[PDB]
Design a protein around this ligand. Sequence first.
Ligand SMILES: Nc1ncnc2c1ncn2[C@@H]1O[C@H](COP(=O)(O)OP(=O)(O)O)[C@@H](O)[C@H]1O
Ligand SMILES: [Cl-]
Ligand SMILES: [Cl-]
Ligand SMILES: [K+]
Ligand SMILES: [K+]
Ligand SMILES: [Mg+2]
Length: 378
Amino acid sequence: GPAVGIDLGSTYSCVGVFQHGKVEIIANDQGNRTTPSYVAFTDTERLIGDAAKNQVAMNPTNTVFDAKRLIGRRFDDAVVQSDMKHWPFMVVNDAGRPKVQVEYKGETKSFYPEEVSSMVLTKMKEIAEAYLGKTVTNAVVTVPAYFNDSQRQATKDAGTIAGLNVLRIINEPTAAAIAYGLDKKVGAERNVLIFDLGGGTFDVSILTIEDGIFEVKSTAGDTHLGGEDFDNRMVNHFIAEFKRKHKKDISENKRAVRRLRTACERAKRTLSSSTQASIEIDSLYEGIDFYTSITRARFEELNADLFRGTLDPVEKALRDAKLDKSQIHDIVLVGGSTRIPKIQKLLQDFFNGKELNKSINPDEAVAYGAAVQAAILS
Ligand SMILES: Nc1ncnc2c1ncn2[C@@H]1O[C@H](COP(=O)(O)OP(=O)(O)O)[C@@H](O)[C@H]1O
Ligand SMILES: [Cl-]
Ligand SMILES: [Cl-]
Ligand SMILES: [K+]
Ligand SMILES: [K+]
Ligand SMILES: [Mg+2]
């Protein structure tokens, strides 16, 4: 085509293309190598990606995200019923299937999860087309290893709706291993552990690979643990700080909390490469500017329990795979949250100093491997 590889993520999506023996992770119109898996509807337009996430603060009920948590599921699934209580948008039942309901151009409309995801895939397809200067049709799309047949089918359908010919649906941890060339034949079997901490989910997968064939030996994790929870801890910290300094509580002002969360998420990224970050928000609440800062040490303390807790699923995955830590040949970091130094320290310490595969931006590793596989299948 070339054919492309797309990581359709819970919170960010990423597209890559393999050419001249190299994977190019493609930047979008705003120069971002990943794009929010968000879609929004207004009185006059449909927004996707950066454009949609940039207005979530002002249009919460018609800005959809987390479609991946509904895709391929039944409305009566316990997971769906539980998640619905936390989303600002409406989810309705259409003959046993969930649909997100929103207002668009003044009329009520509803979309199946695969239609919402097809919008995100359309954006990734267009991002690749702008870079290649050619039409893109063929693609490999990834999914969590635990997705069942229905979830895989609905994900493939999202691609087809977007005009893609989905060559294959492959597992995220497998795509990550392929990115590092761990699929090459070296003789004996090899055990690889994928530690994937994204914006909303934490996945530990142990793969055994031999003759280029992958076997998922075990999986563990938490579908409700991710970078967004670390942002939440920072938000609560700063709401308390603003209350102490101005004797005002901003908790019930949705736009204030949103601007604070956005600044916290950005400060967090800075803390993965610097030991302090500044937060400067003009007129945060009632015209009061909020200029402050946070140290990496404080950020780690605010999240100490959540960070240390990522090791339990690692131990559980090892136990279920009937493997001792010493039998893991490679550890691969995936997910933007694995860029956090304290998480890398915890994991490396747990593995007694074993080095981590982390040269490929973790938030891009899944798309990177998908792109490689798409070229192979093409
Ligand atoms: N440099 C960084 N340091 C800490 N967290 C990061 C960094 N870059 C990205 N993240 C986090 O990774 C998360 C989501 O991106 P990934 O790219 O993780 O997506 P997904 O959740 O869809 O798998 C977010 O919580 C984001 O803030
Ligand atoms: Cl874009
Ligand atoms: Cl530590
Ligand atoms: K992603
Ligand atoms: K994940
Ligand atoms: Mg991910």
